[PDB]
Structure 1
Amino acid sequence: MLKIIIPTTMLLPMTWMSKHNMIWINATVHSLLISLISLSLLNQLGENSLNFSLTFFSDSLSAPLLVLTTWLLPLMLMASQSHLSKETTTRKKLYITMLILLQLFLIMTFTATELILFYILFEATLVPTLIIITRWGNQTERLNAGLYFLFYTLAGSLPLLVALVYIQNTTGSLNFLIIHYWSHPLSNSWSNIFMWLACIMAFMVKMPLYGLHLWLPKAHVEAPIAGSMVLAAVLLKLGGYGMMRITTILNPLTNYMAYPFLMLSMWGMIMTSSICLRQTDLKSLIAYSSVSHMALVIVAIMIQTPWSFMGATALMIAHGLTSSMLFCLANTNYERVHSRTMILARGLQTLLPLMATWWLVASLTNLALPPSINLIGELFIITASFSWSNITIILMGMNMMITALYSLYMLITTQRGKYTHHINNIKPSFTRENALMALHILPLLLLTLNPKMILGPLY
């Protein structure tokens, strides 16, 4: 696992010793090479795992997340190249340093053979994103946003640490392998109920759960483009990964402790979806769509069936890619209009046809069109929930319909109709933006050809 960590560390001296005008080129090239190296982790075995050492290991659930994390950084650099043009060399180098540190923390988080190390790195990921949001943010609310994004998370995760050390005082180890092999049932007691809550709420607050999701629209709207990309694609999946890793010890309590959350998700994925129908902001609409998808992922994980786990993993990967692409398109519009309001810039397909095509493809993937992996995860989770209870389909059905509606709404309001007359600063799209959308969309349609790479260890 060091063959991937060490180059990520060397990205820092590489960046700081580069020329004043060659930071972007070198960073992009070497990040792409690191992603190519990370592609090797995709091969897996039906048996235990790839146990590299006592400190790190890999699995069919960690490998896709690592590949996506490594692939994202060049896209974030390409997106940030534009609005950071008038910055000093030191500040751009510091921005690249924050991105590199965030990638390294995520890489060490996803391997993390021991649970306390997982907690330490999972909370270490919080600092670079906070700095990114509160330092290079356009609006005046960014500061407030940061506070939210901080405290919510910490409020969730401080009890978890307690539980973890308590577990180590009881079981004697927090290594995931020993935990899996020496698992014992959890008796139905008040102490065990509170241990369950302490273990679960930390990952609930980050998914986010409906009712605990107030920080997400703020953080996604006020953050810069790279911050929004990394928040939507990878940072939301940390909660799902931790939940999948930790429910091996919570049984059989999860059979009946899951009831309050499931409903909160099953109803929530409706409410948030309806919210997307009445929104005056593109970034807010995308954030609420992310909330709906992650609530459905929560439902999947709480069902606790093999089909649930496969669907949840596929949906996590697909939603990450789709949300990053949508945020990128909204940013391309914003850098021209400087408004971030849906209704002001209209009829753009006449002026920007290829970006209209990119918008159409992104909406279609978000709409869960078959045979895209979005639909694969969608349908697997829906089937598992129907097995759980035949009534759930109703809610899922509603969600599906509403999804399509607002997706096409976002496509029709912005790209279709008559152009706004008084806007005349709409230049033809640059090669950088087209390359960014292509690099977002091609991996999705390539992954639909080999879905077994993103179905997790239960395939």
Structure 2
Amino acid sequence: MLLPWLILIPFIGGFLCWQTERFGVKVPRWIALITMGLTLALSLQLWLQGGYSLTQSAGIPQWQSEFDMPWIPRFGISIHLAIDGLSLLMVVLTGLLGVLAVLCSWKEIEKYQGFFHLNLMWILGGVIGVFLAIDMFLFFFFWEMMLVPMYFLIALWGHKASDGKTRITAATKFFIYTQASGLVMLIAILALVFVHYNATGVWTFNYEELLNTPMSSGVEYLLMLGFFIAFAVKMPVVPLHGWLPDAHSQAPTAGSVDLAGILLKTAAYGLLRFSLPLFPNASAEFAPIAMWLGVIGIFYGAWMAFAQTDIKRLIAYTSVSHMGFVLIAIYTGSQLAYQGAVIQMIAHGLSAAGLFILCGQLYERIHTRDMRMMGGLWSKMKWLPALSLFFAVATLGMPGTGNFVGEFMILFGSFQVVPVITVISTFGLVFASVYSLAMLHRAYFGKAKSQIASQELPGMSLRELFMILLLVVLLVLLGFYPQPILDTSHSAIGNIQQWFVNSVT
């Protein structure tokens, strides 16, 4: 199977990136690009050979490919990997964002750049493993391993303007939030493994076997909450979001960590792949609380974004507001909302990526991220201001940008299940418009509010233009023709939706 190589190539390339700095400080970047290019090519090959569009839901579990190798036999833990329309779509996004993460940090050719790329490649290897792992321990291991590289990238290669103290403070907060939450999930994985043994007599960590574990209402609820705590920190779900704005602000200014370790939806997939299938009844009775937490994140994130001054922290809070819609959808039991969640998870990744990459490029010219020191940048630059407007139009969810397809599909499906929550949630589209236009008016429109913004700035390079324009084409195509993506995730999302509904009944 090739599934194992979607995780190995990134890891092997990371080692090569470090061992090739001896041939020059301009070599590691090419090794990283080839590494991510090969993983992306392999992902596309799997897409063109799986016939996902013609796969009909046969019921969980339903994998197009699977690999199993003994890892820790004593505990029945193995390297079990499996692909599906949902997982495939998340792996190809990781490959695309990984190539862009390498291209964005291309002018960074300082010493120890090999270790930078090693950490970047390993963050991506872990993310791909999280989307492929079907062994509960492998899932947890990949969930927690990807955090160590991220910690050192935010603390040692973080915002060039921030002091070491501020960067470390942010990295520690991110790690403690995430590793501790992940540990609460291990406690629940271990409890599920023991409840299975006691109820049946088998010792397994395989998701396929633990899918129907006879358990009481109380234990199922506690086990479900344990997984949710881990998926609430990475989504994020308010009030476990404080770590996000800080990490984004102190992360490599170029935007590499932002795209690789913060824009891949490993928590939304986790809620759809494990929480909903493993604990169907508990998820159904927690739906009200989860959906209301999402509504709060929609308005709280929007208000927090409006008052940010820092452009990168503004974009960071917009993510909390947008992910609230996905949380509401995951707990509706509607195929339309689930399919829309998949589109939004992909669209937000592309729209947020563009904003984060453009933010880094802007810093390279004005050496500031404070919007109070910008203004009239539309008349001082050649592309950045116009392209930032596009990504903000997509962020507010303009029809024709792909973010609209996901957001409206979620609302249409959610309305059929929870009408009142859908009505209040739709008003979030007005708040989005407020923060989206606020950022454009406070940075590119009006008059220069500082001297640096009052001089013609260097123009965007071909590399910068290519990566940003690629994201523009993808968002527009996803907005006008989203069917090819919907046809790939239909079987997987159908299996999950049926399981949840049928199990609750």
Give the secondary structure class of the aligned counterpart of 1:57: strand
Could you list the per-position Cα deviations for residues 264-296 of structure 1 after superposition, in whole angstroms to 9, with x for gaps in the alignment? 221221121122222211011101000111122
SS in 2 for 1:401: helix
Please state if 1:10 is matched with 2:12: yes
Unaligned residue ranges in structure 2 (runs of 5+): 69-79, 197-201, 495-505
- Quick one: which amino acid aligns to residue 379 of structure 1? F
- State how 1:52-91 maps to structure 2 within 5 Å: 52-54=66-68, 55-82=80-107, 84-85=108-109, 87-88=110-111, 91=112
Q: Is the 8 A contact 1:267 1:395 kept in 2?
A: no
Please list the CA deviations of residues 296-337 of structure 1 after superposition, one character each: whole Å capped at 9, or x if unmatched: 211111223222221211111111111111011111111112
Looking at structure 2, the residues matched to 229 and 156 of structure 1 have their Cα atoms a distance apart, in angstroms, of 22
Shift of 1:436: 2.2
Q: Which residue of 1 aligns with 2:357?
A: 328
Task: Name the counterpart of 1:114.
Answer: 135
Q: Does 1:260 align with 2:289?
A: yes
Q: 2:331 aligns to what SS in structure 1?
A: helix
Instruction: Tell me the distance in 2 between the aligned counterparts of 1:451 and 1:374.
Output: 14
Matches within 5 A, 1:419-430: 419-420=448-449, 422-423=451-452, 424=455, 426-430=457-461
TM-score norm. by structure 1 comes to 0.92
Q: Identify if the C-alpha distance between structure 1 residues 421 and 117 changes in structure 2 by more than 3 Å, giving closer, same or farther.
A: closer
Moved more, 304-313 or 286-295: 304-313
Asked if 1:144 is matched to 2:169, the reply is yes
Across the aligned residues of Structure 1 and Structure 2, the Cα RMSD in angstroms comes to: 2.0
- Mapped partners of 2:421, 2:484: distance in 1: 26
Distance 1:249 1:442, change over 3 A: same
Q: 2:334 touches 2:414 (CA, 8 Å); kept in 1?
A: no
Comparing 285-294 with 254-263, greater Cα deviation is found at: 254-263
* Residues 1:379 and 2:408 are matched in the alignment: yes
Matched residues in 1 for 2:290 and 2:8: separation?
A: 40
Of the three residues 202, 225, 229, the one matched with 1:201 is 229
Q: Which amino acid aligns with 1:168?
A: V
Report the AA paired with residue 244 of structure 2: L
Whether the 8 Å contact between 1:336 and 1:425 is mirrored in structure 2 is no
- How many residue pairs match? The answer is 450
**Cα displacement (A) at 1:136:** 0.8
Instruction: Name the structure 2 match of 1:233.
Output: 263
Among residues 320, 341, 346, which one is paired with 1:291 in the alignment?
320
Match of 2:65 in 1: 51
CA distance in 2, matches of 1:257, 1:5: 34
The answer as to 2:474 corresponding to 1:443 is yes
Letter aligned with residue 361 of structure 1: F
Which of residues 189, 200, 210 is equivalent to 1:179? 210
Q: C-alpha deviations, 1:138-164, integer Å up to 9, x for none?
A: 313111111111111123221221221
Deviations 1:111-146 (A, max 9, x none): 112111111111111111111111111313111111
More displaced stretch, 240-249 vs 324-333: 240-249
2:156 is aligned to 135
C-alpha distance in structure 2 between counterparts of 1:430 and 1:41, whole Å = 33
TM-score by length of 2: 0.84
Q: Which amino acid aligns with 1:264?
A: L
Of stretches 287-296 and 14-23 in structure 1, the one that deviates more from structure 2 is: 14-23
Distance 2:213 2:401 in 1: 37
1:38 pairs with one of 36, 43, 49: 43
| Counterpart code for 2:36 | S
SS at match of 2:96: helix
User: Quick check: 1:432 aligned with 2:469?
Assistant: no
Output the CA distance in 2 between the equivalents of 1:155 and 1:363. Answer: 34
In structure 2, the CA distance between the partners of 1:254 and 1:10, relative to structure 1 (3 Å rule), is: closer
TM-superposed CA distance for 1:421, in Å, is 6.5
Aligned match of 1:96: 117
Q: CA deviation at 1:194?
A: 2.0
CA 421–166 in structure 1, closer or farther in 2 if over 3 Å, else same: closer
Show structure 1 runs of 5+ residues with no match.
none
SS in 2 for 1:52: strand
Query: Given the alignment of the two structures, is residue 222 of structure 1 paired with residue 250 of structure 2, yes or no?
Result: yes
SS of residue matched to 1:252: helix
Percent identity over the alignment? 27
Would the aligned equivalents of 1:102 and 1:129 in 2 still touch at CA under 8 Å? Answer: yes
- How far has the Cα of 1:348 moved from its partner? 1.4
Q: Classify 1:187/1:418 alpha carbon distance in 2 versus 1 (closer, same or farther; 3 Å).
A: same
Q: Which residue of 2 aligns with 1:105?
A: 126
Kept in 2, the 8 Å contact 1:49–1:57? The answer is yes
Shift of 1:418: 2.7
CA separation of 1:330 and 1:194: change in aligned 2, threshold 3 A = same
Q: Could you tell me how far 1:13 is from its partner in structure 2?
A: 4.8
Shift of 1:425: 6.6
Q: Describe the superposition over 1:310-367 as per-residue Cα deviations: whole angstroms up to 9, x where unpaired.
A: 1211111111111111011111111112221012121111121322221121112112
Whichever residue aligns with residue 163 of structure 1, its letter is: A
Q: 1:13 to 1:159 in 2, by over 3 A?
A: closer
- Distance in 1 between residues matched to 2:296 and 2:261, nearest whole Å: 24
Q: Distance in 1 between matches of 2:397 and 2:406?
A: 9
* CA–CA distance in structure 2, aligned partners of residues 345 and 275 of structure 1: 20
- The whole-number CA distance in structure 2 between the counterparts of 1:273 and 1:252 is 32
Q: Secondary structure at the match of 2:378?
A: coil
- 2:195 paired with 1:162: no
Taking a change above 3 Å as real, the CA distance of residues 26 and 402 of structure 1, as seen in their structure-2 partners, is: same
In structure 1, which of residues 357, 363, 367 is the aligned counterpart of residue 396 of structure 2?
367
After superposition, the C-alpha distances for 1:348-406 in whole angstroms (9 at most, x for unaligned) are 11121322221121112112111332111101211222122221233122100111121
Match of 2:343 among 314, 336, 360: 314
Q: 1:69 touches 1:107 (CA, 8 Å); kept in 2?
A: yes
For 2:137 and 2:9, the matched residues in 1 are separated by 25
Partner of 2:273: 245
| Other structure's SS at 1:218 match | helix
Distance 2:182 2:28 in 1: 36
Change (3 A) 1:334 1:40: same
Q: Equivalents in 1 of 2:312, 2:206: separation in Å?
A: 40
Deviates more, 1:10-19 or 1:347-356: 10-19
Query: AA paired with 1:202?
Result: A
- Residue 30 of structure 1, CA deviation: 4.1
